[PDB]
Symmetry: C3
Subunit: 252 residues, 3 copies
Amino acid sequence: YETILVERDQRVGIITLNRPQALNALNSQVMNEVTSAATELDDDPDIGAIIITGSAKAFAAGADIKEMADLTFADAFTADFFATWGKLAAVRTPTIAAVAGYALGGGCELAMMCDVLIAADTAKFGQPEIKLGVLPGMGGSQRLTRAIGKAKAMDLILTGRTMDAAEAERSGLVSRVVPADDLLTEARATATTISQMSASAARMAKEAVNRAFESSLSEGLLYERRLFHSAFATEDQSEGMAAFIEKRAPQF
Amino acid sequence: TYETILVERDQRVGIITLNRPQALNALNSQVMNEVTSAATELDDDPDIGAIIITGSAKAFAAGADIKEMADLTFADAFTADFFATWGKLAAVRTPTIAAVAGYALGGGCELAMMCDVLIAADTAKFGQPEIKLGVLPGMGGSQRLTRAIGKAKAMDLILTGRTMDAAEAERSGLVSRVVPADDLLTEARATATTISQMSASAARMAKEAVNRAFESSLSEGLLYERRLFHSAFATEDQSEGMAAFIEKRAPQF
Amino acid sequence: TYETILVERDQRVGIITLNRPQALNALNSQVMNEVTSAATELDDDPDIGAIIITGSAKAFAAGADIKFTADFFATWGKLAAVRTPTIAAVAGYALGGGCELAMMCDVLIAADTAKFGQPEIKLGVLPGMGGSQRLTRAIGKAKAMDLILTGRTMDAAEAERSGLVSRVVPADDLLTEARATATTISQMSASAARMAKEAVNRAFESSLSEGLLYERRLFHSAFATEDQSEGMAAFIEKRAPQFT
C-alpha cells in the first residue's frame, strides 16, 4: 500500500494512515486501501479486532481538496463519490479508532465510522466542510448529531469550530480519553481484550448495537432478543457459560 | 407474599426491593416473574402514583443466574422466548424510578435502564459483562444503553465488559441524578413522592410522550405529543392545577 | 410594528428579541405569531444568513402563558421550517414553552445564569411545543423523564454536559458571543449552510442508513453550486472565499 501501513499482532490488525506530508488527509486512494485492508482483515479468522490510527500529529486532517476541486454534480453522481467508505461500516469484526491530534472533516467522520473510539488527550475533532462551500459527505451530519446532540452538532457543522478531547468525551463522541503517549498502548490493550472474546459473540454484540440507529426501540429490542436466542446455538455460549460456572477461564 | 422481593406501600409510592443478598440480587426467572407481577399490581392500583425499584446498598443487581441459561438450546430459547416477560415492566403506565446502589451489571444494568427515572448512588457501577460469557445483552442492553450514552461508549462497554462509575453515567446520559449512598433511598422516595402527587393521568401521559421519542420520527413524535396535549384539557386536573397556581398554593388532584 | 418583540438587522444577521419583561417574556399567541412572522421574513430576506432569538438577561422566556379543532400551538411549527440557521441565546429563565422554543433552534448558546425546565406537569398539563421529543433526544431518557415528571430545573452546566446546549458563556458576554457565532455562520455560503442544517435535521427523521444516503446526495448536489467551487479554489489558493 502507498498510503497506509498494516500489521498483525496476534489477533489484532492495525491499519495506520500513512501520508505524513499531508497530515494523513483522506483521499480516493486512502479510501480504497483502508477499505481493502479492513475488508481483508475482516475475512481473516485469526483477526478478532481492528485498530485504525494515524500519526501522533494527525489522525486525519480532512479529505484531499484537489481531488474534489474540479468535480461537477455529474462526476459526483456518477462515481457516487465517497460511497466506497460504506465498506468500512460493513466490517463485521469490531473496529477501534485511536485518534491523536487532528481528526477533521473526513477524518472526524472516519473515526465516527468505527465502533470504539479512543482519543489522546491532544485529540481535536471538527467538521470544517462548510468553510469550503460544501457540507460533510462521509456521514458527519448523521453520526455526529446522533453522538452529541443537535445543539453541538449544529454548532460544529455550521461554524467549523473544533472540539477538544475532553468535550468530545463528555458529549458522547469518544469512548475514552488517554494521555497522548499511551494512546497506542491503550488502544491495543483494548483491541486485545476484544479479540480475546468469542468471535461470534463480539460480531453479534456489535450488530445488535448498530441496530439502535436503524429502527424503533421496539424493533431493536426484538432484534436483540432473537440474536440473543441464536447465541445459544453456538459452541462459544456453552463454553463461555460453563467456564464461569466452573470458576475457570473460558477457552473458545 | 413473594420469595425474592419485598413490596411495600408508602402512601402513594410503591417500593419494590430485590431481596436476594446471597446472590447479590442476581436476576433469574423467579425475580423476572415476581418483579413484573409486583410492578403490574402497583400499576393497576389507583392508590399508587409512582414505583421505585432498588436492591441493596451493595448491589442493585449483579448479573443473572447463569445456571438457568447454561444448558439452554436455541429451541429452548425461541420456544420459551427467554426474557420476553421483562417487557412487562416497560408496559407499566405509572412512572418507575430505579434507585441504583453498588452493582448494576448485565441484567441489572438493563433492569435499571427499563425504568423511566434513574437515581444512582455514589457507589453505583454499571456494566454489560454478557460478552465475557459468550453471549450478548438480551434484555435491551444493546438498545437502551446505546441510545442513552452513544455508540462509542456503548460499544466500549458491551465489547469489553468494562464498568462505568456513577460520575461517568451521569455525564453521559445513563442516569438522572447522583446522590450520596446514605441518601439514595431517601432521595428516591422524595422524587417518587413528587411524581405521585402530580395528576396521575397527566403523569402517565407525560411518560408516554417521552417514550414516543424512541419509536418514531421527530415529526411523528411531535404530532403525537400535540394530540396528547389537547386531550389533557379534557380533564379536570387541569382546572385544579391552574387554580392552585393562581392561588399560589398546592394542588389537590 | 411589533408589539411583543424587537427586530434588528446587523449585516447578514437578524436578531429577534422577545420584549415583554412585564411577564418575563412569557409566550402568548401574539408572541408566537410575531416571532414566526419575523423569522419567516428574515428567512426570505437574501441579505440575512443567520437569525438569533433572545429574551432579556433575566429570562429568555419564563414559560408559556397559562390562560383538535384549532390545532393549538401549531403555528410554532413554522419556526422549524425556517431554512436559514437559527441561534437561541438563552439568559436566565427558559421554562416550559421557553425551553421548547430554545430547543426549536439549531444552535443554542446559554448564559451561565440559564435555567432550563419543563414545569408543565405541575399545572397538570404536558409540554405541547415539542419538549417531550426534542428534550429526550437531546439529553436522553433518564433526564428527560426526571425533568418532565418532577418539573425540576437544569442549570447551564448540566445542560452543557447533557447535550441540551452548544456552549456556555458568561452572562455579560452572551449577546456578543451569540452575535459572533451568527456572524461566522452568516459569512458561510448560504446554500451550503442551508444544506448543512437540513442534513443535520434528517438525523431525527429516519434510520441512519437513509440519513447517510440523503447527506451524500446533498453533498453531491453541492458540486452544482458556485460556492463549492469558490470555497474550494480559495482553500487551495490559500485565500479568502468570496461567496455569491
